[PDB]
Amino acid sequence: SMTQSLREVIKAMTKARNFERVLGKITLVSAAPGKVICEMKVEEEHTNAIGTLHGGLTATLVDNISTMALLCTERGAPGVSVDMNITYMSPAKLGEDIVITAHVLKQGKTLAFTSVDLTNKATGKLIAQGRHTKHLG
Amino acid sequence: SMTQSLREVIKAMTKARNFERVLGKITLVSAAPGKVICEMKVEEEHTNAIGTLHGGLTATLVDNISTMALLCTERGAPGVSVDMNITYMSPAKLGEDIVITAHVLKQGKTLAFTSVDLTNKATGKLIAQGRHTKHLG
Amino acid sequence: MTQSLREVIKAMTKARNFERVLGKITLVSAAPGKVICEMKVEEEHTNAIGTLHGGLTATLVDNISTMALLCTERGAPGVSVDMNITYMSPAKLGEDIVITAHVLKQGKTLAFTSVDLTNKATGKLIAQGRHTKHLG
Amino acid sequence: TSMTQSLREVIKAMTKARNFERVLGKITLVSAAPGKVICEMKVEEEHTNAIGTLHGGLTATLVDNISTMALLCTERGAPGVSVDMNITYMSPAKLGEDIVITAHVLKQGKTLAFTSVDLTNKATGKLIAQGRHTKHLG
Ligand SMILES: CCCCCCCCCC(=O)CSCCNC(=O)CCNC(=O)[C@H](O)C(C)(C)COP(=O)(O)OP(=O)(O)OC[C@H]1O[C@@H](n2cnc3c(N)ncnc32)[C@H](O)[C@@H]1OP(=O)(O)O
Ligand SMILES: CCCCCCCCCC(=O)CSCCNC(=O)CCNC(=O)[C@H](O)C(C)(C)COP(=O)(O)OP(=O)(O)OC[C@H]1O[C@@H](n2cnc3c(N)ncnc32)[C@H](O)[C@@H]1OP(=O)(O)O
Ligand SMILES: CCCCCCCCCC(=O)CSCCNC(=O)CCNC(=O)[C@H](O)C(C)(C)COP(=O)(O)OP(=O)(O)OC[C@H]1O[C@@H](n2cnc3c(N)ncnc32)[C@H](O)[C@@H]1OP(=O)(O)O
Ligand SMILES: [Cl-]
Ligand SMILES: [Cl-]
Ligand SMILES: [Cl-]
């Protein structure tokens, strides 16, 4: 399964020394062609100085989970980031369960385009939305 | 001293249990009203799976260093992130020294606009540029 | 709501100001916080090489998202703070495009919207934008 | 310079068309140099929104076109096609105001080019908007 494989990727991230370690707490909900859903509980390690989800972590989720969606395509190339944007619509608080849903919008010869929504698991309310363009080598 | 105060903040960040810990390695060059310059050496903890500066860490640098520039204004409100964008123009390799320069572009009643350049310290070449809008206070 | 928006579109068509550059659009649906329009790409909409001009796409994102904001309880159009657009496929002269705008979140001072432009024939995304506006 | 003269004639020619490039007919070129272009424009009724300020979509159009001109003023000289563009709006440009649009090339490579554009009030220097624009070259 691409599900079995994405689980191994997440396991690898957890024990990493590099920056991939910061998402070690995420869990995989589903993988499908060009679509990945993960979930995460907001813990202290994920927060800023005021106890909400750090905007840089949100960016890191947008980046990594969209990259996972790209792994889940026929080409399966993760690429390198070219442009990313994130809009922050509601805070995510410590202890809240969040859902991160990534979709591939379009794949070309040298560029891929993805979108990510972070939502509150309980309410489905949008926390943030991001778009991420990657260059494929 | 504005620089000395901000240096102390950076030192505290280093000891944090929360996400602010991820920038523990940065050093402060200068603080002035609406302008902050930091430097960081890219180390393993900062990298992605291909050994370059992780795009989410770049995002976190844009976020935190622009927030520091807002702390260095008369109003001094850090705000909360509304929109951030980052463009990735060249990789920063493990062991490379980088400069992060943040400017406040405009401060209004309820919104502040900031921009950040990350450059290679040796060559001056642009690694990434971001813009970051925050809602005040 | 639909009738009001239809009239707005008629007014922009006849305008001397920049709102004129969309005169050629059709309202398909207006609902709470969601508007769907369509447009045939004509010469007036193209760049030097005859494809849909990126600034006109930007103008569609800006205007149609603002229309979605008009279709809310508050009904304030706001003023633009941040806009981004990702361009995925070209739209050629003569092609029909569907522009769908929706309100993601509304608050006291800020509103967030998203817009898709799609080729009607093929359903493929031409562009996607997001637009944050400040409310008075 | 010869470069400014060349670009000026490219602009005059391209803005006379029935196509969308016409909406920039009122811009004036100040200077073209390697990777950097400076234009100016007086905001008139045709440039405005329903509240009498510079229309956000025309600001985007200025960003797109003027950055593309900066790319033409390079050795590569490829205008490219837009991939990602963002704009941040800091202050209104009012009817009758002179604006300066300054575009510069940040970096270019084999297939991608990166540009940034500031719109400023000519008289006061203050920032109207700032955009960034990534284009695919081939
Ligand atoms: C059917 C009817 C529909 C018609 C639609 C027509 C309207 C749609 C057109 C539109 O979208 C215009 S968008 C054009 C491009 N964008 C801009 O020009 C936005 C520029 N950005 C800004 O002006 C600011 O950065 C702003 C977003 C307002 C910042 O907000 P904030 O920080 O909260 O406020 P400031 O500190 O800058 O200003 C506080 C307050 O004071 C006002 N003020 C004072 N003096 C002026 C002058 N001379 N001009 C304009 N405004 C002035 C500010 O406007 C602000 O007013 P608000 O309470 O509304 O924020
Ligand atoms: C150590 C030295 C100092 C260092 C400090 C550094 C800390 C930096 C913290 C930081 O930058 C956090 S950024 C995290 C990512 N961003 C976000 O989480 C922001 C998400 N977006 C939003 O919250 C909104 O979209 C908002 C920008 C606030 C929208 O603005 P507006 O429309 O004007 O506001 P709303 O109508 O949504 O909200 C009204 C107002 O009332 C509040 N509100 C609504 N609901 C709640 C709840 N449940 N709790 C608390 N407050 C609520 C909003 O907080 C808002 O307050 P203000 O406008 O006065 O700020
Ligand atoms: C299953 C588990 C495995 C999953 C692991 C996932 C790992 C994903 C990692 C990731 O996404 C890294 S993203 C980090 C942030 N982004 C960047 O660092 C990108 C910076 N931007 C660029 O490098 C350029 O702007 C680029 C997008 C490559 C520009 O494209 P283009 O114009 O086409 O290319 P260039 O002309 O710049 O370069 C051509 C070619 O040569 C390689 N190159 C050039 N210069 C360098 C330098 N200095 N160092 C290393 N490599 C260089 C370029 O990468 C490019 O190669 P490709 O043919 O592959 O495009
Ligand atoms: Cl934060
Ligand atoms: Cl990365
Ligand atoms: Cl406008």
From the list C18, C1, C20, the residue with the least C-alpha distance to C9 is C20
Per-residue tokens: C85: 């657009």
Residue D17 to residue D25: CA distance in whole angstroms = 9
Per-residue tokens: A88: 């922050």
Is D111 annotated as a binding-site member? yes
Contact state of D88 with B83 under an 8 Å Cβ cutoff: yes
Distances (CA, A) of C107 to A106, B110, C80, C112: 32, 13, 15, 9
Beta-strand relationship, D28-33 and D36-42: antiparallel
Q: How many domains does chain D have?
A: 1
Amino acid at B126: L
Q: Are B33 and B67 in contact (CB under 8 A)?
A: no
- Put simply, the chain D residues between 24 and 53 with a CB less than 8 A from any chain A CB are none
Q: Are C101 and C68 in contact (CB under 8 A)?
A: yes
Contact state of D90 with B83 under an 8 Å Cβ cutoff: no
Beta strands in chain A (DSSP E): 27-32, 35-41, 80-88, 97-107, 111-120, 126-135
The domain that contains B70 carries what CATH number?
3.10.129.10
C109 burial level (CB within 10 Å; 0-12, 13-18, 19+): middle
For residue A54, the Cα-to-chain-centroid distance in whole angstroms is 14
Residues of D in contact with B133 (CB under 8 A): 88
Question: Phi and psi for B87 in degrees, rounded to 5?
Answer: -120, 130
**Backbone φ/ψ region at D41: left (φ over 0), alpha (ψ -120 to 50), beta:** beta
Ligand 1 atom index nearest CA of B112:
32
Question: Phi and psi for C61 in degrees, rounded to 5?
Answer: -55, -50
Distance D75 CA to ligand 6 centre (A): 36
Beta strands in A20-110 (DSSP E): 27-32, 35-41, 80-88, 97-107
**Backbone φ/ψ region at B79: left (φ over 0), alpha (ψ -120 to 50), beta:** left
Distance from CA of D5 to the nearest CA of C (A): 20
Residue B88 to residue B55: CA distance in whole angstroms = 8
Touching chains, D (3+ CB pairs < 8 A): A, B, C
Per-residue tokens: D70: 């900066």
Please count the residue pairs, one from chain A and one from chain C, whose beta carbons lie less than 8 angstroms apart: 35
Q: Are C42 and C26 in contact (CB under 8 A)?
A: no
A133 touches chain D (CB under 8 A): yes
The closest CB to that of B84, out of A47, A48, A86, belongs to: A86
Please work out whether the CB of residue A78 comes within 6 Å of at least one atom of ligand 3.
yes
Residues of B in contact with A56 (CB under 8 A): 19, 22, 56-57, 59-61, 63-64
- Residues followed by a gap in chain C, C→N > 2.5 Å: none
**Backbone φ/ψ region at B95: left (φ over 0), alpha (ψ -120 to 50), beta:** left
Per-position b or e across D7-26, b if 16+ CB within 10 A of its CB: bbeebeebbeeebbbebbee
Structural domain harbouring D127: 1-138
Contact state of D85 with C84 under an 8 Å Cβ cutoff: yes
Residue C81 to residue C75: CA distance in whole angstroms = 18
Distances (CA, A) of B114 to B64, D29, D109: 11, 28, 27
Per-position b or e across C81-108, b if 16+ CB within 10 A of its CB: bbbbbbbbebbeeebebbbbbbbbbbee
C130: closest chain B residue by CA: B83
Q: List CB contacts of B128: < 8 A, sequence separation 6 or more.
A: B58, B62, B86, B87, B88, B89, B117, B118
Residues of D in contact with A111 (CB under 8 A): 83, 136
Q: List CB contacts of B58: < 8 A, sequence separation 6 or more.
A: B86, B88, B92, B118, B127, B128, B130
Residue C120 to residue C15: CA distance in whole angstroms = 27
Per-residue tokens: C109: 């001072």
Please work out whether the CB of residue D138 comes within 6 Å of at least one atom of ligand 3.
no
Q: List CB contacts of A53: < 8 A, sequence separation 6 or more.
A: A42, A46, A47, A91, A92, A93, A96, A98, A127
B60 touches chain A (CB under 8 A): yes
Give the resolution value in Å.
Answer: 1.7
Q: Dihedral, CA atoms, C47, C51, C53, C57, nearest 10 degrees?
A: 170
Residue D128 to residue D119: CA distance in whole angstroms = 5
Q: What secondary structure letter does DSSP report for D92?
A: P
Q: List CB contacts of B45: < 8 A, sequence separation 6 or more.
A: A17, A18, A19, A21, B22, B25
Residues of C in contact with D23 (CB under 8 A): 18, 21, 55
Please count the residue pairs, one from chain C and one from chain D, whose beta carbons lie less than 8 angstroms apart: 118
Contact state of C16 with D65 under an 8 Å Cβ cutoff: no
Q: Are B97 and B89 in contact (CB under 8 A)?
A: no
Is D78 annotated as a binding-site member? no
Distance C25 CA to ligand 3 centre (A): 40
Name which residue sits closest to atom 35 of ligand 3, judged by CA.
D109
Residue A78 to residue A69: CA distance in whole angstroms = 9
Task: Count CA atoms closer than 13 A to B10's CA, side-chain side.
Answer: 23
D134 touches chain A (CB under 8 A): yes
Ligand 1 atom index nearest CA of D49:
9
CA angle at C15 for the pair C13 and C16, rounded to the nearest 5°: 135
From the list B131, D55, A90, the residue with the least C-alpha distance to C61 is D55
From the list A85, D107, D75, the residue with the least C-alpha distance to B119 is D107
Per-residue tokens: D5: 């003269």
Touching chains, C (3+ CB pairs < 8 A): A, B, D
Residue D28 to residue D32: CA distance in whole angstroms = 11
Distances (CA, A) of B130 to A62, B42, B123, D83: 16, 18, 19, 17
Angle between helices C54-70 and C2-14 (to 10 degrees): 140
